Ligand binder design. Sequence first.
Ligand SMILES: CC(C)[C@@H](C=O)NC(=O)c1ccc(/N=N/c2ccc(CNC(=O)[C@H](C)NC(=O)[C@H](CCCNC(=N)N)NC(=O)[C@H](C)NC(=O)[C@@H](N)CO)cc2)cc1
Length: 300
Amino acid sequence: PNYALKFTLAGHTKAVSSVKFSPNGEWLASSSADKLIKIWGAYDGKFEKTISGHKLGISDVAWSSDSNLLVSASDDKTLKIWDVSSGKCLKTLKGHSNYVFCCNFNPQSNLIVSGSFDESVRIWDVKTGKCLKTLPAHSDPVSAVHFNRDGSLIVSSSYDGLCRIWDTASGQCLKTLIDDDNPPVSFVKFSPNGKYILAATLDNTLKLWDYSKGKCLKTYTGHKNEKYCIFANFSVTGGKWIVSGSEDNLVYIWNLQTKEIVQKLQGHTDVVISTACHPTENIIASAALENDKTIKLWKS
Ligand SMILES: CC(C)[C@@H](C=O)NC(=O)c1ccc(/N=N/c2ccc(CNC(=O)[C@H](C)NC(=O)[C@H](CCCNC(=N)N)NC(=O)[C@H](C)NC(=O)[C@@H](N)CO)cc2)cc1
């Protein structure tokens, strides 16, 4: 592809931790160590509004599938659910006993899943703000959580070096994925069609799993990732790419099928912690840590 820098989004006063496109494609939401959520135009990069309320820094944010709600995960041990158009905090989700690290809605958006440094995964009711399940998911901080395409499954990852797949409805562990070694797993998510999971590990490696057979199918390397929980992505609006941030301040793009690096995006001045792919255009958002503080929008 030919992604080129179109906009730089400045305004967070500390490290940006996470960026996400709304499912309707109109907006970008960003979370920061500065305790704020910011909302931006997805196409023009224009600053829209700031959403505030958390008492400590925020590590993750996610949209409901109707683009009306956001959920954020905080070091203050809570998640909050926000009505984006009014800026209202609808619910505060209490129950983790350490930093909340990651969060996501299910496609129906009646459930929220969260992962924490308390080594648990929790499943919450959106309408009532109540925790429906706690899963004893891992033996170290939970780095990522994600619903599959129809909400029936959750995948979690942890510093303990495991990916686990869970049944949403019952809370039972359906699968533990483990390879030749178990370096910390720093990120995991389902592929859009639901057949694979992509997992990143702190050994500078991304891995594509066929989780039904339980086998690693592809390996992506060349980037630097030994310390941070960096988001990765399936890019599926154009060519089929894998997109990831990197601790050498670059955005990496890989050919999904052949596994070669097909583009490296330069511009950030600190670790690229988060990338997101626009749901219908060939647009990538990337965000960086404390010495950069900016979000970049790239188009192919
Ligand atoms: C090689 C040897 C030594 C080996 C054996 O011991 N050691 C290791 O494997 C190892 C060593 C150090 C390691 N330390 N890594 C970090 C250290 C400090 C930080 C500080 N935090 C940040 O810089 C940013 C702003 N926050 C984060 O990276 C994460 C959120 C990342 C994106 N979210 C997501 N992927 N779901 N959050 C945090 O680190 C803490 C919990 N929260 C915050 O910082 C909030 N204020 C803002 O996120 C992060 C990672 C990790 C592994």
